[model samples]
Target chain A: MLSARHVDFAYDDSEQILRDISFEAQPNSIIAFAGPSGGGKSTIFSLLERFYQPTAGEITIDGQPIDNISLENWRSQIGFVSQDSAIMAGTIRENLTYGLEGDYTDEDLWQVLDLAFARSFVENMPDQLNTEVGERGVKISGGQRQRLAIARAFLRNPKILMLDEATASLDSESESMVQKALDSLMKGRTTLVIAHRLSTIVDADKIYFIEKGQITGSGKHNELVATHPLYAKYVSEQLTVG
Target chain B: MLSARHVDFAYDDSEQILRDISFEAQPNSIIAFAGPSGGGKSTIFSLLERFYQPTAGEITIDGQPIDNISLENWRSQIGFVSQDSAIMAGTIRENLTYGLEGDYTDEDLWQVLDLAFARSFVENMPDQLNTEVGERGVKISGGQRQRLAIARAFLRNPKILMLDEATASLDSESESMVQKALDSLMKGRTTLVIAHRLSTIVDADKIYFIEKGQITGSGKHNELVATHPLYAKYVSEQLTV
Candidate 1:
């Protein structure tokens, strides 16, 4: 299990980014961090990744405190997909096996790319596996970039996955495709997803309503919709405008 | 009236972006260009602004071929808001009235900011109107950058308004606020908007679906939804997922 025990964090001395944030995720369960913009949601992800240290409390993986683990060992066990995704300027094969120095073959690359809805597009490219994707994958659309990001993540085969607004920048069609890939990827992992869109997290095992610097609400969709007024208001707003 | 009469445009020879496209917008109308990314929607806007000349056909403003008019004289009649939506490192006052040489006042700036739903935020700044917004408006959030863009457009008060994905980059709350500001800005002008989100253009007076160098469909939301099966499929895919 992954857990944050009474974590309190701040960027500077005076500005507290998060306060007393606590949550736990059992192995193979999906967790979602959601809230309005500038509400310290991203700060929690930074803490989970150990990019920032908390002023109070600690985080643990399994039963070991995060501080006891080496940064490489901790990061290697996780895969992250961000909203502003980046794909290296090279062939699909080069990008897929970037960080991993391994004995994996081309067949392994195709399997993960196929699962990410990239098989068709990759095949259509003139260079196939050797085609240069250009800087930041600028040659492709926003959705295609996301698909590539997912394919890269699948290649990592991490124990825990983190997605920050993965579909926010994509168009509707691209978003649907990426969402489908995400569904398959989340089946058996400790997934931590962040989204401003309510529909994206309706099926999450647990939703954390974060505000200012605290976890104001945490529950299943139905339970929060029934018991938490803020959560209920958020759902209503999404339904009406979305 | 705003009209593109059988206009043909291209950035290079052999690859035409807009192919004999035609559309008309009456005063006070809000029309949207809805299509896939890089589907030549922004190319059409560039033609309207005379940034690029059409290789064939004609674009007219109030029944006069656009190319015949002086560039300065022509551009002054139109308002343009773009996607990157960044402000320079200067006070909000200077950035708001960059193009205009004079005829701006503090009260006018405040009014336009209020209409853009940015007055409150601007008011909270330490220096208010005199605060330096910084390079490309990086100090502010994505939503604030868009609101400032809208506020700058409102300052122009032009008869014809063009926006390229004005609200696409904002969060849901900010998108709503920008959409509301766009509604007010479009009230008395002929507005042409380019959008990727289906919901953003559902209420537009007319929508043109462009793809692979051609306009595949054109009509109001319900009309195209019923007549163009491909368009319907695209809309459903976007709305559902």
Candidate 2:
């Protein structure tokens, strides 16, 4: 289980991005955060990743405080995929196994690609696994780059999975394909999702509605839709034309 | 007027990204390209910017072929903004007026910022216009960066404007604000827009649906909705979801 107890954060002394935020993630379950942009959802991810320490309270994983663990060890247990995933300018194999220290073969790589739903696209490339992704993976489409990031996460096989609007930039078709892969990946792992598209997180085990650096409500999608006014407004806003 | 006639493009000879793509943008009108990802919308912008030449066919502005004009002269007449707008590590004032060579007072700067809907945000910053944006403007949000790019374009006062998913990364609220600003900025200027979001270009004077590096359909939004099956499907998908 993962738990954050009254966490407070700020980049500088003047402004606080997160305030007294607290949440819990049961083992082998999914938790989601949905809110307006700049409501501090990403900052929570940064804290969970141990990129920054909390100003107060504590974060614990498996009943042990995260700050006590070494940075490398803590990160090794977590897999993160964001909208703008970093892609080194190198071969597909190089990017997939980046920062990993194992002797992985083609078979090992192919298995993750299959899980990521990226196998067909990679196979179509002229060099397959050896194909160059170019600087920041510009040679491929947005959907393709996102799948590569998912494939990399599959290789890591971490205990906790974090997705920060991983499918937000993709087209509808690509979003469905990637969403299916993510559903499979989430099984038997503690998953945390942040999304602006409320439809994407409707099936989450628990949804937290955050605004102005605080959690205003938490429940399943249907429950929030019926009971939470702000949550309902956000859901309606996404469905309606601007 | 801007025109692309039978343009074909390829980053590598073996694979063509655009195939016989053709379009026309009448002066003081809005032309939009709406399509699936990797269908060669952005490649057209690059060609128009003269970053890469078309493999075949010709591009002309005002009946004069682009090849005849000097690079500086051709580029001076156009303004381009993409999803990933570049921001140097400098103050906001420096970025908004980076290329222009003229004496611009704070009043001049504020005028463009107000037009871009960026005035309030810039004013709230620690040092106002002099606040450093950090490397690539990492300190600001994506919406802010885009607005800054729009402000920069307003300062340029170009005859033509190109927007490549300029508001794609912004949230619904921010997108609406920027969209309003764009609506005002596009008046009496030749504007070319590329977007995956169909709603953004529903009011465009002309909308072209591209697929497999070719124009699959071209018409107004309502006309395409009635006549083009694929275009209709794309529009419905966005609405339903």
Candidate 3:
């Protein structure tokens, strides 16, 4: 299992971004964090990814502290896709296989793109997979950039997958297609999501409701809406509560 | 009225991006472009902003072609917020007034931030208005950057507002607040939007449905859904139909 236990975090003593946060995702299960924007959801994420050490407490994976593992090794197992996923200034081929250990054939890259529901977006370009991106490259939309990130995640074949509003920028047609790709990818992995959309929330095994950097509640969708007033309010705002 | 007549665009003969595109946005009216992603929505925006010149036809405001207006003057009257609204590497104070010609008080800056539903976010920062952003600056969230763009637009006080999925990155709580702020900001202006969300589509005065660089249909939300099969399919996919 991957877990954070009694974790507290602050950024250079300016403000406490997370407080006494704790949760667990058993192997092959899914968990999530949902709250107001900037309520420390991604801060918890930065911890799991080991970007910053928690000021207090510990994060353990499979019964061992994460700090004990080689940082490179630890990250290889974790696939992360966030909203505004950084699309590097390079070709599509360079982007999908970035920072990974392996020689991927062009055919290998195309298969991953198919799994990302991103073929059409790439196929339309003049150079196809060889197309450059960003300033020196062909300009691409936010939705297309997001799918490229998803394709990168697919190439990783990670055991732990975390998505932070991965589909927020997509149109409805692309959203459903990408959602299916994510759902298939989530199976048999330890998945975590930070989502405002109902589609992901209803499917999570547990939802950690955060507020003001505190874990105010934790439960499944129906359970939290029935008992936690804040979660109910959040759900109602997103049109998730009936 | 702001209008495009027989407009065609190509980025150096690579391919046609927008073909035979024509529309009109009467003064103080809201018009929108909606369809699949990358169907040339922002390219249409480029024409209006004059970032590019159309290969054929004309774009005019009132009766004069937009080309007649100097580039600098034409842009001052425009407020645009896109999905990845660029936040320069500078103090929030500097960013809010980046392109404008004015001396704005700290008090004026705070007020615009409030109007953008962004004051609380800034208030949390250690430096508040003085906070630096991006590399060599404190990293801000995507949602925060989007709000800063809205606040910048508020300072411009433009007569034409264009939002390309301005609130997509915001959570539901922030989304509704920003949408309200945008709705207020949009009033009595020549507004153009490129949106996928239900909220913007339902509120738009006219929707131009595009597909493969063509204006497949154009009408109000209900009218297009009732008669245009492609638009109806697009709407249903996004859960608007």
Fnat of each prediction, in sequence: 0.00, 0.00, 0.00
Ten-residue region with minimum lDDT total, candidate 1 chain B: B80-89
Model 1: per-residue lDDT, tens digit, B80-172?
Answer: 444323445367775666434335788988989888877887877777788777653427766676677678778767778776553355467
- Residues B110-189 of candidate 2: C-alpha lDDT, one tens digit per residue: 88888887788887777777878865343876667767777767875777877655335548766786776776678778
- Tens digits of per-residue lDDT for model 3 on B1-241? 7779889998768888888999988776688898886688877876676646688899877777875654433444554554323444357886676534436789998888888878887777778788778556678756567667777778767777776663355476566766666766787678888876777788789889888898988888888888987787887776352
Q: What does DockQ give for each predicted structure?
A: 0.01, 0.01, 0.02
lDDT (Cα, tens digit) per residue for candidate 2, span A1-242: 89999998999987888999999988678898987777899889999999999988699988899999899999999998776645457888988897998876977887688667666446534456887666533256555577778888888888999986644344232345566667767877899988655455666889888998999888888998888888777777753331
Give the lowest summed-lDDT range of ten residues in model 2 chain A.
A166-175
Instruction: Give the lowest summed-lDDT range of ten residues in model 3 chain B.
Output: B80-89
**Candidate 2, residue B195: how far the Cα is off, in Å:** 41
Give the alpha carbon lDDT tens digit for every residue of A136-174 in model 3: 656665545767887888898898988766444432223
